[PDB]
Design a protein around this nucleic acid. Structure first.
Ligand SMILES: [Zn+2]
Ligand SMILES: [Zn+2]
Lengths: 260, 148, 44, 66, 62, 152, 115, 82, 50, 67, 151
RNA sequence: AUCGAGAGGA
């Protein structure tokens, strides 16, 4: 009637992704962790734009949408910043937002690539990922001689439930039972299917013998980071966020039980 | 006791018409103590059954060792002594037909009780003496155990 | 006897329920019932 | 029109179907009177068609309001 | 090209045509939807005489 | 075609005397569908006495009140004694079979092709099945229904 | 024109309760927990943790409409137990599991970066 | 027409039920007295259906015959099916 | 069986006799009916006006 | 008109790869090898780079509204 | 726009009152694409549901008495069948006989008429799907189907 | 705004 005692085994850790395995947990816990990776791990992203001048060939909403999708390093700052809902300030303040400025003008004859390097921030900790000290800079717009783009953005705290720009992942590979032992899939021709990278089967064997007493355990994860957070920071923040969702739910539950 | 029928059967054929369903298999079996034919649908995925196997089949009206009716509701938190403890494969179904060789004037010498365990069908046919416990629209249990 | 009496009552009630209601526009209803299938049957 | 507008259905029902002008002109020349029995005639005049819920009248029951 | 926002339309006592005082035609005119002959026939088959009178008398041009 | 049909039949209606009439008040049908029944409640059924042979019809519909042991298998003891002893009941059952045979000839002239599929209000076999399951009728035991009660 | 703001899936409206408990009258010792502004993420884990309790006879959840942003979790327990107590223990167990998982993931990361 | 012998059906037609319920619901909405008791109903349609189930709608249905005569049936005199 | 000759045998069963039938490309129902060895009872036409 | 920022499917950043992709293509890489060099392993991101039409280069052939 | 017209529509033209059409004395609406392919797959003989799956499905029954039915298989592991859950979906105590579209025509003659090898020959008794694979013939718009008999 | 025409949707 009590909690699982999950174990963890990290099989790869780079700056780009983290590949790990959780054992002795329920499939619902594993999938809620997977969902929180995508939808409830907050990060910083541009969510307010003011175009002072845009002579480029892309209209204002195009530039704004494009700026919103630039990942901003959010590692230690996202926990400190507040949601503008919770901030007791006006529209903005340094406690709930980060100011960016962009001011580019193509005077020279070659096309000027307005890239994420031109997004200048007031906060040194929250900068475009590509601008962080290889991979090139994200391209915001190409400008022709005489074209000019001057804008002022504000980045906010949010998560992927509100908009995919606050999603920190560039793909969450999730898998379990690589050999189809639980038979949660039913291959019409099991020989036709390639083997999982996590499979432990000799090549003559297509799928594992059916396990009637089996349950999903040993979930394999590959959490790729878009750049804002480190992959391990994505996983840790996901676990913390899920735990705070449950804690808030329990607080409200206690108020409802005692009020009855 | 609550047992409508008990005998030892021997699997004489499996899927004469061919495999119709993947996880379900039809066994055509015959006993020795009563000379009763049996067609039975079993989930071979969880309880595989091979040709020539020999098992004890017990059609019961209840699982409780003492005479006590069942409510037809699922109660996993039940600590009473259940006779399902003494068997490996247990199903729960209802009798939906009782045929016989009766005439307009003569009673039936042979009966044929049909049971459905949530769609897995069984036909137990043989002497009418061994099938007086069966009544249509009545809930029963399978209670089947393999023996060597 | 109980089953037969219940059966008689059931037949009577369902028959009285099958009787056409005064005010049914059976002509418009029949025109629709004959024109709707006409939209599916083949021209050639 | 050769079978439906040749019966005694009333000029307003007939004008709804076909030959609106010819029908109404014939009725004028012959002084025909539409008794407003069909559904088309009542629908045109915005009156309750004698159809379905309109095939009867409701009266208040003074002896039962007590 | 067929986006729902260019198709959604509603009316409740909007403008009316000059000749016959009935709702206008079209989204652009804030018009009403046509309760046509086939709708009249359907509601006659239903036997809904008050709804038929509401649609063809009271919701169009009393 | 649809518009033409509608304008031709639009005002035909079932009146409170149960006749179907047009706007002119002329009578189109004395009863709707020749049977005064609505088309939603009727459903497909089978006439059981249309197709069978004379021998099969006799064997399936003639109540046999001479076979004592067959009645003993079908009916309870008091019902068997009343059916075998009483002659008023036997004449009632005999006239029941004669009436069914007359009905058979009427069906044979109504359906000159042997098609027993008919559309009728109440699905009597389904109602009988409903009664069997509602009252837990045991098909193997003798019944307590008097055949005279069935006829009456 | 009709697009709800994206925050309405996560944010509670003023005067709207996060969770509401309603006694289920069909069977005894059953309750319906209507949780607002949550989705399958918490519903699935709460249900599956409740299924681990042998004193829980029923544990299910549903999102009645995807366009709406609430879940309903039905919990039935044995008579000596309570669905509110079962729900509380399920949340406590999930919290403890996630705390342990977080600490062990921190340890695994430390081992991986170090050696 | 002899009220002692009314030839029309003793059942309320679906159209009679529809119009009687609508009429009585409008009457209730216009502050007419209610004939049945009320727990918490405030919708006139629900009150009218409760009155019909209770057989306490003070309305008479005047069914016209093709010949021109009519038959008056109290809503309590008819058989309510649905 | 819709065009076969459905009779009732002496035993009381419906029997479908397989018999020759003619289908014409024009209609003279008035004349064809009054011909020897032509059935004036079942012979019909699809021209409702005739 | 311009290379998207993220992959529509996963959300991987592809905005910084268009210029590198073109530079690899003029370096006599095949499109597949070029996509492998940029680290686009999921066929969604390979779709993003491989099916992109740089229309902005044609929109920059028109003089702007202001000099 | 009036209580009278509202009552008219509520008592005459509401969709449940419109399930059976007078045109052909059969249902006009039936079970349709995904629900029909899925109910065919669901009522196959080898569909076994686990306890959590069964509770998930029972969450979506509006007309559920809150009693979990006794599983068709108790050992070695409790498993409910798709027919056992559709029996909960089926209302009242209706009785119905149909035949799945793949029902062989020479099966009703030989043995196994009442124990079908192919799980054809739909039989619903007392509102329980005793046997058979449901399909268009059982849940579609034809005459004598489960939806018609339910209405 | 009207009218007409055209292009489309189901
Ligand atoms: Zn602030
Ligand atoms: Zn991608």
């Amino acid at each position: 009637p009590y909690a699982n005692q999950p174990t963890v085994r990290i099989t790869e850790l780079t700056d780009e992704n983290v590949k790990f395995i959780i054992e002795n947990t329920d499939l619902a816990v594993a999938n809620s962790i997977r969902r929180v990776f995508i939808a409830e791990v907050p990060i910083i992203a541009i969510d307010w734009v003011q175009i002072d001048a845009n002579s480029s060939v892309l209209h204002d909403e195009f530039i704004a949408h494009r700026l919103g999708l630039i990942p901003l390093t959010s590692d230690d700052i996202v926990d400190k910043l507040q949601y503008s809902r919770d901030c007791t300030c006006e529209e903005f303040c340094p406690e709930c937002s980060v100011e960016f400025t962009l001011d580019v003008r193509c005077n020279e004859d070659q096309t000027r690539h307005v890239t994420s390097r031109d997004l200048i921030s007031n906060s040194p900790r929250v900068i475009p990922v590509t601008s962080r000290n290889e991979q090139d800079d994200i391209l915001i717009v190409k400008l022709r001689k005489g074209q000019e783009l001057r804008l002022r953005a504000y980045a906010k705290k949010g998560f992927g439930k509100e908009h995919a720009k606050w999603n920190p992942t560039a793909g969450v590979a999730f898998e379990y039972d690589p050999d189809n032992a639980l038979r949660h899939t039913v291959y019409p021709k099991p020989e036709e299917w390639p083997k999982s990278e996590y499979s432990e089967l000799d090549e003559d064997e297509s799928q594992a013998p059916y396990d009637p007493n089996g349950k999903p355990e040993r979930f394999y994860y590959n959490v790729e980071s878009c750049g804002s957070l480190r992959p391990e920071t994505i996983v840790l923040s996901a676990l913390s966020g899920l735990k705070k969702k449950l804690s808030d739910l329990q607080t409200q539950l206690s108020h409802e039980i005692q009020s009855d | 006791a609550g047992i409508l029928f008990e005998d030892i059967f021997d699997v004489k054929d499996i899927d004469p018409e061919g495999k119709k369903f993947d996880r379900v298999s039809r066994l055509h079996c015959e006993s020795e103590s009563f000379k009763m034919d049996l067609i039975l649908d079993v989930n071979i995925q969880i309880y595989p059954v091979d040709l020539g196997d020999k098992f004890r089949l017990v059609i019961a009206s209840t699982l409780y060792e003492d005479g006590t009716l069942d409510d037809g509701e699922y109660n996993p938190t039940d600590d009473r002594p259940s006779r399902a403890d003494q068997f490996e494969y247990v199903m729960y179904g209802k009798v939906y037909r009782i045929e016989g060789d009766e005439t307009s004037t003569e009673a039936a010498t042979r009966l044929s009780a049909y049971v459905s365990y949530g769609g897995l069908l069984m036909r137990l046919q043989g002497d009418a003496n061994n099938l007086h416990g069966f009544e249509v629209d009545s809930r029963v249990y399978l209670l089947m155990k393999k023996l060597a | 006897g109980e089953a037969f009496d219940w059966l008689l009552g059931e037949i009577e009630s369902k028959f009285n329920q099958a009787i056409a209601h005064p005010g049914e526009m059976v002509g418009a209803l029949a025109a629709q019932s004959l024109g709707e299938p006409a939209t599916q049957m083949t021209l050639n | 029109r050769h079978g439906v507008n040749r019966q005694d259905t009333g000029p307003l029902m007939k004008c709804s179907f076909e030959e609106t002008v010819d029908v109404l002109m014939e009725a004028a020349a012959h002084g025909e009177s539409d008794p407003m029995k069909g559904v088309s005639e009542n629908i045109m005049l915005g009156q309750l068609a004698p159809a379905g819920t309109g095939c009867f009248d409701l009266l208040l029951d003074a002896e039962k309001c007590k | 090209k067929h986006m729902v926002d260019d198709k959604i339309h509603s009316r409740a006592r909007g403008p009316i045509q000059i000749l016959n005082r009935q709702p206008m035609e079209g989204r652009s005119r804030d018009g009403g939807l046509r309760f046509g002959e086939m709708e009249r026939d359907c509601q006659i088959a239903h036997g809904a005489a008050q709804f038929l009178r509401e649609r063809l008398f009271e919701a169009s041009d009393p | 075609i649809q518009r033409r049909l509608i304008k031709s039949m639009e005002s035909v209606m079932v009146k409170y005397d149960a006749t179907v009439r047009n706007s002119i008040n002329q009578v189109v049908q004395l009863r709707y569908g020749e049977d005064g029944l609505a088309g939603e409640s009727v459903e497909f059924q089978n006439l059981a006495t249309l197709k069978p042979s004379n021998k099969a019809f006799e064997k399936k519909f003639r109540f046999d009140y001479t076979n004592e042991r067959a009645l003993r298998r079908t009916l309870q003891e008091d019902l068997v004694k009343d059916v075998l002893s009483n002659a008023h009941i036997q004449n009632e059952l005999e006239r029941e079979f004669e009436r069914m045979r007359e009905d058979r000839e009427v069906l044979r002239v109504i359906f000159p092709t042997g098609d027993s599929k008919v559309v009728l209000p109440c699905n009597l076999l389904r109602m009988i099945w409903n009664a069997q399951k509602i009252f837990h009728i045991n098909p193997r035991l003798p019944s307590d229904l008097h055949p005279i009660k069935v006829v009456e | 024109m009709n697009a709800p703001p994206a925050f309405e899936s996560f944010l509670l409206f003023e005067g709207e309760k996060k969770i509401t408990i309603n006694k289920d009258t069909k069977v005894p010792n059953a309750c319906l927990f209507t949780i607002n502004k949550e989705d399958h993420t918490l519903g699935n884990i709460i249900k599956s943790q409740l299924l681990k309790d042998p004193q829980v006879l029923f544990a299910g959840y549903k999102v009645p409409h995807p366009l709406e942003h609430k879940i309903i979790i039905r919990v039935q327990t044995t008579p000596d137990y309570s669905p509110q107590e079962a729900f509380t223990n399920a949340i406590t167990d999930l919290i403890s599991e996630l705390s342990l998982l977080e600490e062990r993931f921190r340890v695994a990361i430390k081992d991986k970066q170090e050696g | 027409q002899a009220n002692q012998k009314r030839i029309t059906t003793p059942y309320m037609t679906k159209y009679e039920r529809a119009r009687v319920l609508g009429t009585r619901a409008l009457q209730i909405a216009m502050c007419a007295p209610v004939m049945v008791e009320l727990e918490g109903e405030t919708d006139p349609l629900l009150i009218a259906m409760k009155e019909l189930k209770a057989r306490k709608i003070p309305i008479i249905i005047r069914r016209y015959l093709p010949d021109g005569s009519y038959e008056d049936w109290g809503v309590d005199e008819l058989i309510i099916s649905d | 069986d819709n065009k076969k000759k459905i009779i009732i045998t002496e035993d009381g069963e419906f029997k479908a006799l397989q018999e020759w039938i003619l289908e014409t490309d024009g209609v003279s129902l008035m004349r064809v009916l009054s011909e020897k060895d032509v059935d004036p009872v079942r012979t019909t036409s699809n021209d409702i006006v005739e | 008109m311009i290379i998207p920022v993220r992959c529509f499917t996963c959300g991987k950043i592809v905005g910084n790869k268009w210029e590198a992709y073109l530079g690899l293509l003029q370096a006599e890489y095949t499109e597949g090898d070029a996509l492998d060099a940029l680290g686009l392993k999921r066929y969604c991101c390979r779709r993003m780079l491989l099916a992109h039409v740089d229309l902005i280069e044609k929109l920059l052939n028109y003089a702007p509204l202001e000099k | 726009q009036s209580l009278e017209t509202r009552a008219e529509i509520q008592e005459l033209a509401m969709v449940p009152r419109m399930i059976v059409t007078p045109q052909s004395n059969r249902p006009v609406m039936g079970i349709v694409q995904d629900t029909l392919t899925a109910v065919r797959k669901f009522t196959k003989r080898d569909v076994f549901l686990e306890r959590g799956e069964v509770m998930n499905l029972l969450m979506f029954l509006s007309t559920w008495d809150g009693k979990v039915p006794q599983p068709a298989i108790l050992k070695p592991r409790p498993l409910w069948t798709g027919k056992q859950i559709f029996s909960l979906i089926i209302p009242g105590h209706i009785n119905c006989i149909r035949t799945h579209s793949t029902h062989p025509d020479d099966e009703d003659s030989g043995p196994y008429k009442h124990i079908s090898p192919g799980d054809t020959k739909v039989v619903v008794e007392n509102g329980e799907l005793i046997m058979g694979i449901l399909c268009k013939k059982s849940l579609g718009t034809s005459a004598g189907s489960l939806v018609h008999i339910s209405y």
